[model samples]
Target: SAWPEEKNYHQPAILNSSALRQIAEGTSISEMWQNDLQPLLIERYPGSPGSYAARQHIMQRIQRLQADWVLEIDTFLSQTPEGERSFSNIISTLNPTAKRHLVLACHYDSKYFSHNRVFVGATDSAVPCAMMLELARALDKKLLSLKTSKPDLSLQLIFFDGEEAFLHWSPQDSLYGSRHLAAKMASTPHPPGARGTSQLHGMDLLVLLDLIGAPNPTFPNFFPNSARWFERLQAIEHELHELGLLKDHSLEGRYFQNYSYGGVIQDDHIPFLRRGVPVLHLIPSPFPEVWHTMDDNEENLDESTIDNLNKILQVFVLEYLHL
Candidate 1:
């Protein structure tokens, strides 16, 4: 609706404690678990039967928004370690005409396995995927109301297809969907009135979530380019925890911190990071206990864990869009 730089979206924004409480009130762990996570907790490797069901489940949730979103099924075939496999990255832009966007992405495809193993990747990515849907559902009212005002800033959610390694965790085997989608976004031009010409360039930040379902999660600052925004998210969590707006969590340290961590664990953000994009990598260091094992199913996730994170994400998105 307007340009990016001088638009109202550039305003410095903050929400009070009461607003945080209200956002937290909207986040329901039980609701998200039953409605969103239940369908995703399957052996959803790429091109599997459960994978299609998960995709359909997510699409149905978006469909309920009643055209407030622009859905794009970015499906393509990729030459992989096993063979040519089908891949699709589910994408939804809240307001396509907006000049600037904030991307929240997670890999929807789970790790493939053999020997009759049921690889239900709950914490690996299904929990993050559920969090995105819950964020959309929790803030749909705000997004709908703000659309009448035509805010120049919008939100985009991407459920990447292939993130797990088929054979090995090499660059070629992993990140199939994002690798293709990043190229497609970079090649395509953004709408007029945007700062940059390409759609990829229009993004303000790409915040990725992975391996984040267990209790007592902490994420250290990984990139200085997005440090300001990362600090904002950390502040939001601390503020909410202090005000007792978040679910019952650690009474001591905050979920996010400025700890100087080691090298970045590469995942979906690598392609965009290499392209000079600002990324807030939300995956924790020394990953969850039930990371890749069969135990990482619904039993692996905690109620307060996803609940608290969802509450923080809800407020973060709203504040970012200046809603």
Candidate 2:
């Protein structure tokens, strides 16, 4: 709502089971959420209470990959209202000092539905969150294999918290974590021993994903200035189609378009965009009918939809990072 024309810009696991399920069901991303991810959340914090334990459960999952990436995965915790009761943006990078960074982000918290005690938010963000975890896992493996070459790109995966509004959707009630982190990164210099340039200056692109698991969902350009990136996404889908990577059914013409026609969306990217970061909001136009409704659960998600998008994103990020 503020910018015009400016630029800018899991996992594994039971690794074998996830891959096998993807091969068998083609809904591994969705399955990951229903089977592993959601179970973890509910088992640890039933009903999705706004408690530190709930957030910690997610933090633990983010940290689980640390065993695979070691020093590469760094968890940056930002206190909003209080202790771990804050929005945690878990980030990972191969080379922190790289002047430019590629940022891939998604929100992990579910909306605080007044009536429903257990809102899974499958499409709202569960799938995107799980997709981020899968990409990080895949990318980490690839990066390790290419350690000798050491590409000059810095990639960070951020899982944002407090994306849902506590009450009504207002400036103060939403995007708590992203808004806080963006200002902090912009004002604060690199820590004494950090190798990379300031986090704020290093950001070259900010790709935000939300409402991503529905079948045949369309992604539109919310910001015309970021059309190039949107085109690149379409191109990736095209190439994948030719290679038979994307399913024939999902190979509809034009996966993305100017559905928003230079409109604006209230998402995690707003904070970074306000600070001059260019953004590509990968959210489908005319959000799914189930959006914010009780039907936004695993049963309503299209496995093929999430699978195809996951493939496109995987290839897109790898292409950008030169993996």
Candidate 3:
């Protein structure tokens, strides 16, 4: 079966979750919105035509993408059945020295047992997964065109698996991949300049993307030390605006919102934060209602939203390279 694959999630930090969720769980909310419509939606049965066909086709497409990425990560990390830890499948461009690797990361795992069905997370993360891939392509192109000037920093793309829980929620069950990586980074041998070093001097910063592909999103808050990074980000946003690519734009909203009864999530960044790594945990808390549900799929994703993220993230990396 197809599994999750590696992707990049470095995009400008504004999009609307309320809008994305409307597209995602349309039955009640998106019913009125004409711009976001689920054209081929029907009952998932063995012999249904119309919308069912579209749903089946979409499911196939999602499975294919998921399996491809999962296999990619499995291969890159050389994952073994007996292994205790796995390296990130998505990675940075190789260079002579590791230096301070700017790791842009996102978790692809989704919660199970929410409704006893596999949640095909198009928005929860699948869309971001696709966004990451899009970013990778753009960055690779930008890096390729460069002649002499190399960015001061290196890049490490990390697509973390197993960030969600199997049963509802549990700290132990979630963030499994991150915890494993953090432990490895803290204990492993020091070969020259490793980005995973325990000392703050090793990593420039770790930017995490989660629940970021919403239709309309606003980030009014950030980690206490995130001001500098946000300043850099604001500059990037301005650049994106110049390029004409900021959608669902808003400057007034909670940086961290409530997630109903689920409580706030520790997500993938917690492991790194505990280890003294500076993290910009770009996530919409309380999450959207369609989160981890069967309804998360492509119809929920918006092209403009994806474009906005790509533009901001591309500029962020480009500028960070200068730093």
lDDT of each: 0.83, 0.62, 0.49
At residue 175, what lDDT does model 3 achieve? 66
Winning candidate number (TM-score)? 1
Q: Provide TM-scores for the models.
A: 0.94, 0.77, 0.64
Winner on lDDT between 1 and 3 is 1
- Give the per-residue lDDT of model 3 (tens digit) for 1-323: 01001012222333343432322222222221221223322222111242234333333333332112211232123222224333332333323143445667775544444344445565656545545555544445344433234423455556665566544566665666677666665675333544443322345578888776566565544565555676666655554454434555544332232222234458777878877777866676546556756766666665565565665665666556542
Give the Cα-based TM-score of candidate 3 against the true structure.
Answer: 0.64
Give the 10-residue window scoring lowest on summed lDDT in candidate 2: 4-13
- Count the clashes in each prediction: 0, 3, 19
Ten-residue stretch with the least lDDT total in model 1 = 1-10
Query: Which has the greatest lDDT?
Result: 1
Q: Write the per-residue lDDT of candidate 1 for residues 198-285, one digit (tens) a residue.
A: 7766777899999989878878888877778778888888888888876676657467887747876889999888886678899987
